[PDB]
Structure 1
Amino acid sequence: SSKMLQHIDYRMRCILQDGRIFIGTFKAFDKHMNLILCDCDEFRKIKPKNSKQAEREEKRVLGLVLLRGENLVSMTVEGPPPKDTG
Structure 2
Amino acid sequence: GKSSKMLQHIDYRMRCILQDGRIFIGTFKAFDKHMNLILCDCDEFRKIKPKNSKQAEREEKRVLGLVLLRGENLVSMTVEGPPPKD
Structure 1 distance, partners of 2:52, 2:25, is 28
Q: Which has the higher strand share?
A: 1
Structure 1 residue 15, shift from structure 2 partner: 0.7
- Cα displacement (A) at 1:57: 2.6
- The gaps in structure 2 that reach 5 residues or longer are none
TM-score by length of 1: 0.77
Question: How many Å separate the matches in 2 of 1:62 and 1:2?
Answer: 28
Q: Given that residues 45 and 55 in structure 1 are in contact (C-alpha distance below 8 angstroms), is that contact kept between their aligned partners in structure 2?
A: no
Percent identity for Structure 1 against Structure 2: 100
Greater CA radius of gyration, 1 or 2?
1
Q: d(CA) in 2 for partners of 1:69 and 1:32?
A: 5
Q: TM-score w.r.t. structure 2 length?
A: 0.77
Q: After TM superposition, what 4+ stretches of structure 1 lie above 6 angstroms from structure 2?
A: 46-56
CA contact 1:13–1:78 (8 Å) conserved in 2: yes
Structure 1 residues 30 and 17: alpha-carbon distance in aligned structure 2, compared to 1, 3 A threshold = same
Could you say if the C-alpha distance between residues 40 and 51 of structure 1 is closer, same or farther in structure 2, counting changes exceeding 3 Å?
closer
- Please tell me the root mean square deviation across aligned C-alpha atoms, in Å: 4.7
Aligned length: 84
